[PDB]
From a paper:
Aspartate ammonia lyases catalyze the reversible amination of fumarate to l-aspartate. Furthermore, a conserved flexible loop, named SS-loop, that contains a two serine signature sequence plays an important role in substrate binding and catalysis. One of the serines acts as a general base in the deamination reaction by abstracting a proton from the Cβ atom of the substrate, forming an enolate anion intermediate. For this, the SS-loop changes from an open conformation in the absence of substrate to a closed conformation that covers the active site in the presence of substrate.
The resulting three variants equipped with the AspB-A1 pocket were well expressed and performed better in β-alanine synthesis than the corresponding variants with the A5 pockets. These results identified the variants BbAsp-A1+A424E, CcAsp-A1+A424S+I431T, and StAsp-A1+S421E as the best enzymes for β-alanine synthesis. For the sake of brevity, they were renamed BbAsp-5x, CcAsp-6x, and StAsp-5x, respectively. To rationalize the effect of mutations that allowed for β-alanine synthesis, crystal structures of variants AspB-6x and CcAsp-6x were determined to 1.9 and 3.1 Å resolution, respectively. While the wild-type AspB crystal structure contains both open and closed SS-loops, unliganded AspB-6x and CcAsp-6x adopted the typical closed conformation observed previously only in the liganded active sites of wild-type AspB. Importantly, the C2 carbon of acrylate is located in close proximity to Ser318-OH (Ser320 in CcAsp-6x), at a distance of ∼3 Å, which is suitable for its deprotonation during the reaction that results in the formation of β-alanine. In the CcAsp-6x variant, the SS-loop adopts a slightly different conformation as in AspB-6x, allowing the active site residues, including the catalytic serine, to more closely approach the substrate. This subtle difference in the SS-loop conformation may perhaps be related to the higher activity of the CcAsp-6x variant. A similar destabilizing effect on the open SS-loop conformation can be rationalized for the A424S and I431T mutations in CcAsp-6x. The inserted mutations allow for formation of hydrophobic contacts with acrylic acid and for positioning of this new substrate in the active site, both in the AspB variant AspB-6x and in the homologue CcAsp-6x. The latter was generated by the transplantation of activity-enhancing mutations into a homologous aspartase discovered after genome mining.
Residue numbers in the entry:
A (entry chain B), C (entry chain B): 5 to 461
B (entry chain A), D (entry chain A): 5 to 466
């Protein structure tokens, strides 16, 4: 077992632990969710401390002795080694200092090991002065967040690009199938199933464009802002360097933000991304609700489509297939939305030079992106691609629908057709037979006028 | 065009206008929605200034010649006269001072008229010193709000009490009608339409109880808190009196809040009411969505019920009758909810001794209660009461339904019924006719097992 | 008094009223808020019915007799005449049919008058068959909404462009004033007031760009979609015409949307705009909260700035100036946000070929835009432009702040300065005198190192 | 790697695993958050399956040899053994069937072990037929949730009861300390720090009462509703028993809900609790924001109080101690609220006889209650109890404060004090020293008028 000390006092650290006291304080201070910070944040945090070491060696302020040990340790965390040592709670006080410190304390103790030394020999490698040199919480943490968010969004757009492709196929596959369009859930006018799926396809096209764009503002990073944006204690040479390194390390077209005070106090890049995602899920939640409708049944329901069975839907009803893949999408949407409200609240709570609510914000932000990526992947494969149509059921609905009379409207007028249609719904007779009862159009005119393939117009 | 002044400068007031400069400033300062403050708040504001005058006369500090003129003017605003004059915007800066002052400047100029003077002759009847004596914005405005909110809530509960009665009838009416219960929209086991409507009836019973309770905290009023809650420069005798009067005037069992600092800085009474309403509308929005489904018609949908036509549903489709009464309920719910978020935000934004966001809060609060009361009234009368069943459509679904096999399960055993169920799904034949094809059960027996009542009670249908 | 009839029955219309029965039904059916539909929607509705008349004459299906009377009536409503006759409730059932009908019934009865005839002579001019020809609720109403929303957004961006200009001046004006940056509300490091106002200026720059972009999707309009998107009962010639007219009439670069089924069932254009606005107000609500802080006082408070007095702030405290212009901005933000939640809910509730919740949606959407435009206009003039600084109070804060020791950190190290800073806060002595007590830097090194104008970095 | 099958096909289960195929499917189907379902739900799930076994033995329909093995396995999960095995994702399709089945497949395979068999030997102990007898997803899962929610709420109220005690002490401690009340952040009239803390104390008192009440509706449980609420194929004797057992097992005064259709389709019990919590956190988030203000320090801010340092506040600024305990409260509030929106959305999305969104609902609900209980515990101990006052800083603000003129107003009159107040603002001198400069009041008199207690009670400070 180790022992370490701080203003507050002395603390017993497990000897296996690469994490230090400031992390131990925060695990005691903020036992809130007991989740762990997103994996992709840890990776990003390591990329930053590395670029920071690299830059501090380039400006001959950090000894290459220490910096290379740090760089070595970073590279391992980047590779995915020491994640289990990041143990602070995503929901935490101190504006994300206890996250920054968790990285500082782990990268140090593992740079020690790599110098052959032992953990807690902070003398050789110092969390504050060496790992975190030229840096504050207030530039490292967000710069990480920016890179994390970007990586996840890029995963998202891949998954969505695939999802769009999936819907697009079903557009083509179902293009020739005729069905009843519904409006207020009331039977309206003929439409082809495939036109509905094109509709889905295009809203998704748009979601992709909006989420793509949300990234633009993230490419700007506040590195070398230090405390407030003033960039005190940072050498412009370090600032120029640490960015180029971050650009190389990350593989992202990052750029120093033109105003550092601005990029340090404003959280609008995040609210913007969340906003784009919320929109996305509103759309998808709807499309989900549609599929669940059309798949209602299989007898006392619309029964226009069928979705791949993925599990026994019920515990007591034999032969129960529930639309569970859509359902999960619905539920995800409810998350993302609720998360947006958290994000927004947090974004607003900012005061003067710093927003201290960044943690819960980022927790929800990153969560939102991940959840969607997962939901979409499973939904693309397990449900969407496997959707099948009941054309005979769908054609039947057309053949027994008053609503076809919307085609006889420009010859007979809305008033003469409204009365024929009110009579047909009540008596339950075909529209054709009530047009021959009133003798309002001829039979050879009805064969033409009341022909279902009027969707194309 | 009369001229008035305050420590900022001078303004031209129309001479017709009973409202003063501080109101003019606010109409310039906050031209935001250009709505007018709720009618029921104006009434309440007048009730308060009246109780305040009455109390200030009773403690021999306001001259009876001025107070009675004020009381007279209040009584008219209560009766519904001078509402046109209230012209400040519900969304406004200043924590609701510009509302308080719009009541002060109108009650004064009309108490003037009533004592034979002319408007603007403030020397005699003073907005600040007389109308608003023993009072701050921070006690008059909320105390009004509390009375307003209570009156509207009481209208609401009457409307809902009536709505629950409406649903309850449809529970009884539809009690014998059998249909397919749905689960994930998939066909499950039989249920009677009336059981669904009892479900609606009871959630509403509960909504009523929650909204009823939300009122408790409103009965406490902070009158005589003055600026901050310390109650400084206000006489306990005035505080005791002004409450007593407000109780008589309003009709409500109001009580001075035990802690005035508390009742002046905390807005939790309001967030509490909103909360109760949000819950209410979640439930109703659901019930609405149900009805819209069950009325999916005319042919390509469930078609289990029909809701009264109230208008031509569509402009181009002949014969379209839409569930527009339910639809409006859905839309209201979305408001109430969004409003709760506004309310909550505003309630949280409080700092130290005062919450300055009370206006938008109250705007949304009062709006929510009103729009609900209205939505419910119209929905009760023009939809719920007029709902009818398609019992032959509903019974048909049962008769051609696989899930019915759960009811004849204990008399055939799981093995023999697993095969009858797999056969009925494939062939698509009724399970009754597959029970006498196999001749596992008698016709009389099947009458008793596939009884509307028997398939839908706890027990084994035997 | 007039009398009119429909399936439901006979109705007594005031004789003065240009509105018909279908409007009377809806005023009875939906006595919800008793507001009136936005003025700018009425204007838009008229622009549409006009383009529709014009197009129906061009395709020689509407008699020029009737159409020109309609066009005449439209032109007056456009000019702002008959607004008082639009009396249906913004929150209403029927997906916005009762709005469409209110226009139909007013434009007809006023086209009658302009033919010398009398109201209720629907025989001459028919609400359904003539005013509303080639049209459904489901294309007229949204196409209007699209034009309304665009006009209001354009007003908004003007107002905001002006607001940005206002902040930008204060950036320059306050550039030389030094103050204490605060972080978690704790005193941190020097910053210039003007850097704070640049921060405000740039977040606003960004808001403008996002709101500008939100418009793109609105330019696409679904005109000639009719019921469902299929475009049944609409002649492609009418479709081509009615757009070009709408483009000319409106003055907007409108375009027929590539898919009509898509633009008829998806409400993502609206959720997108709301989203952009919500973000905007999060930012502004913050900036507002900042100003109210810095203007706290005037004695027991920060007292770094002063805002124009705009009214007696209090009823009993003499000499009370409250930051009421900022406060109203805060309150507006709370609206816009809550409205976004309404909009989103409504947008999601869509089912199959139509979203029937469009009304409350549009009510909140249009409201949001208007409220902001108003709030911003008043806030730009009445508060922002008049903001004044208390430099002597702000300089004083610098001169008595431990936080200046962040500048002596790279020479002394974080550990030696953390102890000097913990001692100075407790004892309340200057940092200089505790650096000469420890003799850790010379006096000529402190004159340089602890010099406040380190913000520039 | 054992092999299992159901009507979809075959799967390879690790042999270590007590979980079955239906759980494996769901872990594949719903790899969403990769969180695990709350611990307290697992406990509850086990309590239910136990009461269910017990009841099915008591009604002579489950063999005692299987039931006791089940009961044994439940008791272990209750005791906290087999939680590792619960592996389905809180956010999942299927309305919480995959949770029910994860309990069924684990309790079975471990009841097997306990009757000497091997896992996968379902013949003997069957997930569906035995573990889940007399039960559907739609009664077991919610009944669990109800018990879970109750247990966490009871932890919450203990924590809050303690929190209110904490604030209440600071009310007493700080009762004599005078400071400037603020209004719109502008200086107003004197108030005592302790009055502010009593305000906090009482809002919390009220939060407790609201959360207490939210529980009432949870005590009603839908056990024996089976699929839809009709309760078909479940024996009233089982229903009477299984409740009785759940009451003993859980400790809670549970009761069979009068209407089972109602308690099966309505989710208003949950929206009600969330609502109460949201209100709570609005209040706390405010109180938090207050404390952060008053602790704005060290020099360039209010500096009226100090909160216990709990960590180095900053990484680059030496000496930075931040109000991190309050900050965490703020952040929690934002969660709870956002979660309420998720909950509400989900509650509304219900259709007809079942709400299939119950999982995300419950995930957020349970999360909200937990994170609150934790936030409060740590905030009570590491912040509230350790708060200290800067009474000389606070008294100084009073002594150099214009608003103090409201207190010496009745003894000088409005005319003479209007001029002393305009002079004190300009010159910046204390109003006490301007009262003896003009010699309008004696020093002894000023002691009594500018008394901490006198400036802050109802009355006239004389």
């Amino acid at each position: 077992y180790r022992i370490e000390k701080d203003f507050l006092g002395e603390k017993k650290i497990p000897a296996d632990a690469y994490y230090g006291i400031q992390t131990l304080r925060a695990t005691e201070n903020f036992p809130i969710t007991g989740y762990r910070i997103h994996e992709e944040l840890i990776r990003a945090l390591a990329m930053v401390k590395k670029a920071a070491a690299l830059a501090n060696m380039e400006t001959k302020r950090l000894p290459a002795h220490i910096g290379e040990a740090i760089v070595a340790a970073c590279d391992e965390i980047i590779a995915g080694q020491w994640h289990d040592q990041f143990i602070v709670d995503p929901i935490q006080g101190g504006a994300g200092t206890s996250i920054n410190m968790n990285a500082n304390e782990v990268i140090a103790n593992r740079a020690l090991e790599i110098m052959g030394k032992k953990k807690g020999d902070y003398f050789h490698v110092r969390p504050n002065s060496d790992v975190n040199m030229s840096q504050s919480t207030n530039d490292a943490f967000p710069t990480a967040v920016h890179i994390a968010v970007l990586t996840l969004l890029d995963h998202l757009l891949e998954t969505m690009e695939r999802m769009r492709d999936a819907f697009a196929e079903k557009a083509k596959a179902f293009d020739p199938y005729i069905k009843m369009g519904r409006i207020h859930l009331q039977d309206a006018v003929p439409i082809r199933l495939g036109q509905e799926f094109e509709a889905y396809t295009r809203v998704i096209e748009r979601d992709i464009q909006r989420i793509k764009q949300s990234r633009g503002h993230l490419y700007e990073i506040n590195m070398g802002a230090t405390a407030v944006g003033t960039g005190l204690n940072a050498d412009p040479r370090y600032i120029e360097s640490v960015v180029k390194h971050l650009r190389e390390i990350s593989g992202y077209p990052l750029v120093g933000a033109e105003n550092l005070v601005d990029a340090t106090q404003n959280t609008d890049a995040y609210t913007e991304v969340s906003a784009a995602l919320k929109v996305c899920m509103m759309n998808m939640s709807k499309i989900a609700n549609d599929l669940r409708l059309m798949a209602s049944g299989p007898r006392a329901g619309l029964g226009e489509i069928t979705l791949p069975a993925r599990q026994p839907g019920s515990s007591i009803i034999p032969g129960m297939v529930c639309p569970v893949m859509a359902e999960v999408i619905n539920q995800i949407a409810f998350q993302v939305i609720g998360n947006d409200h958290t994000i927004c609240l947090a974004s607003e709570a900012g005061q003067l030079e710093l927003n201290v609510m960044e943690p819960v914000l980022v927790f929800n932000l990153l969560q939102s992106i991940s959840i969607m990526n997962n939901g979409f992947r499973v939904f693309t494969e397990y449900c969407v691609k496997g959707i099948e149509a009941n054309e005979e059921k769908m054609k039947e609905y057309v053949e027994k629908s008053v609503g076809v009379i919307t085609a006889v409207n420009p010859h007979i007028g809305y008033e003469v057709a409204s009365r024929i249609a009110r009579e047909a719904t009540l008596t339950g007779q075909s529209v054709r037979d009530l047009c021959r009862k009133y003798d309002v159009l001829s039979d050879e005119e009805l064969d033409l006028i009341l022909d279902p393939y009027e969707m194309t117009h």
